[PDB]
């Protein structure tokens, strides 16, 4: 278990929620403050088809899929699977959107760290075919016996891309809003029958959301999803884009983001055309912050940075010059500080306010890339 445990004082539980069972419903992984960190036994990549999906994304064979499955198939992540929700408190809510070729379970280092600080985190699984793999049920009977229909990553054409990637970012924002609706409906007593058959009873979530303290966070494609979801849905109060890939977004959205917005970048992923689209979101009247994590790579935000050793990590570009634990800790603590300021939380995350400013040895304020104005 090279995936780090949450740094905060709450115990972390984990479950999956699918509702409804169709290709049009919500599928999410939930991380939440539980009634104990008893065992930490949540399976990281819970189905063999995700490995096949992951092979596809890398552009490789049936063989590589089996090898991934052999290497990573029984790995756990430090959350207590299906542990009861901790009663007696209303929790702020994060909706988390994964990157291209990922899926709901691959951002547990972030989900678990937030949960440990008292948040409920819903990591959505997107059905736009940007996920390496996902599933749904063709009908109610198939759900009942666990008979899954799988949907795998869509590969494109160099020409198709503009329009396809835009439609995908639009579907993703809508899935994020839809997950939020599902949670808010459950919070208000809507009866919900999980299409999965799991010991966690969703009725625990009744009256357990602080309905006013909601945030969207996401990585790469999920970072663009943050921006689209915020422009559409003003129930989300702030967003945090982790190494956003801005390409999918339409020209019109940059003037359409009222909520506070934080860009946390890797050093090595970023390039001028991407940064200039980020700067396009800035306005004299709107809170925008930006920091870059020194010597970090794109994968430093995802759980695969924790999955191999330092040598194999560096060669595979899963790890950067920075220690992976140090990088995720800076991103998480900057994020918490930001969430405290903009969600109005009564916690001590403000002890990391200097991180939002990039005032640390492992941080750059803004970007090291340069542009005109």
Swiss-Prot record:
GO terms for biological process: lipid oxidation; low-density lipoprotein particle remodeling; peptide hormone processing; phosphatidylcholine catabolic process; plasma lipoprotein particle oxidation; platelet activating factor catabolic process; platelet activating factor metabolic process; positive regulation of inflammatory response. It is an enzyme of class 3 (hydrolase). The keyword Transferase does not apply. It comes from the Eukaryota. Its EC number is 3.1.1.47. Induction: Up-regulated upon monocyte differentiation toward macrophage lineage. This is Platelet-activating factor acetylhydrolase. It is found in: Secreted, Extracellular space. Plasma. Secreted by macrophages (at protein level). It catalyses: a 1-O-alkyl-2-acetyl-sn-glycero-3-phosphocholine + H2O = a 1-O-alkyl-sn-glycero-3-phosphocholine + acetate + H(+); 1-O-decyl-2-acetyl-sn-glycero-3-phosphocholine + H2O = 1-O-decyl-sn-glycero-3-phosphocholine + acetate + H(+); 1-O-dodecyl-2-acetyl-sn-glycero-3-phosphocholine + H2O = 1-O-dodecyl-sn-glycero-3-phosphocholine + acetate + H(+); 1-O-tetradecyl-2-acetyl-sn-glycero-3-phosphocholine + H2O = 1-O-tetradecyl-sn-glycero-3-phosphocholine + acetate + H(+). Changing residue 233 to N: Diminishes activity. GO terms for molecular function: 1-alkyl-2-acetylglycerophosphocholine esterase activity; calcium-independent phospholipase A2 activity; hydrolase activity, acting on ester bonds; phospholipid binding. Changing residue 285 to A: Activity is higher than wild-type. Glycans are attached at residue 370. N-glycosylated. Macrophage-derived PLA2G7 carries sialylated complex-type N-glycans that hinder its binding to HDL particles. One of its GO terms (cellular component) is low-density lipoprotein particle. Disulfide bonds: none annotated. Lipoprotein-associated calcium-independent phospholipase A2 involved in phospholipid catabolism during inflammatory and oxidative stress response. At the lipid-aqueous interface, hydrolyzes the ester bond of fatty acyl group attached at sn-2 position of phospholipids (phospholipase A2 activity). Specifically targets phospholipids with a short-chain fatty acyl group at sn-2 position. Can hydrolyze phospholipids with long fatty acyl chains, only if they carry oxidized functional groups.
């Amino acid at each position: 278990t090279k995936i780090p445990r949450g740094n905060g004082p709450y115990s972390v539980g984990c479950t999956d929620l699918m509702f409804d069972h169709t290709n049009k419903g919500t599928f999410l992984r939930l991380y939440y403050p539980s009634q104990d960190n008893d065992r930490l036994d949540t399976l990281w990549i819970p189905n063999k088809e995700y490995f096949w999906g992951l092979s596809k994304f890398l552009g490789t064979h049936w063989l590589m899929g089996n090898i991934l499955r052999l290497l990573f198939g029984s790995m756990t992540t430090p959350a207590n699977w299906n542990s009861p929700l901790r009663p007696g408190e209303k929790y702020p809510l994060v909706v988390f959107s994964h990157g291209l070729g990922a899926f709901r379970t691959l951002y547990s280092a972030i989900g678990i760290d937030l949960a440990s600080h008292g948040f409920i985190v819903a990591a959505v699984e997107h059905r736009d075919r940007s996920a390496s793999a996902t599933y749904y049920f063709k009908d109610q009977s198939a759900a009942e016996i666990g008979d899954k229909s799988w949907l795998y990553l869509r590969t494109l054409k160099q020409e198709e891309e503009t329009h396809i990637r835009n439609e995908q970012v639009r579907q993703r924002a809508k899935e994020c809003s839809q997950a939020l609706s599902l949670i808010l409906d459950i919070d208000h007593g809507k009866p919900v029958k999980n299409a999965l058959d799991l010991k966690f009873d969703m009725e625990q979530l009744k009256d357990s959301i602080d309905r006013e303290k909601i945030a969207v966070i996401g990585h790469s494609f999920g970072g663009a999803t943050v921006i689209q979801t915020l422009s559409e849905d003003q129930r989300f109060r702030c967003g945090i884009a982790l190494d956003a890939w801005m390409f999918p977004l339409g020209d019109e959205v940059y003037s359409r983001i009222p909520q506070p917005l934080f860009f946390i970048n890797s050093e090595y992923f970023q390039y001028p055309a991407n940064i200039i689209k980020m700067k396009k979101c800035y306005s004299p009247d709107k809170e925008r912050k930006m920091i870059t994590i020194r010597g970090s790579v794109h994968q430093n935000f995802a759980d695969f940075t924790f999955a191999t050793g330092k040598i194999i990590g560096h060669m595979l570009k899963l790890k950067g010059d920075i220690d992976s634990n140090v990088a995720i800790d800076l991103s998480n603590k900057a994020s918490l500080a930001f969430l405290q300021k903009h969600l109005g939380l009564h916690k001590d995350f403000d002890q990391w306010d200097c991180l939002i400013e990039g005032d640390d040895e492992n941080l750059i304020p803004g970007t090291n890339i340069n542009t005109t104005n």
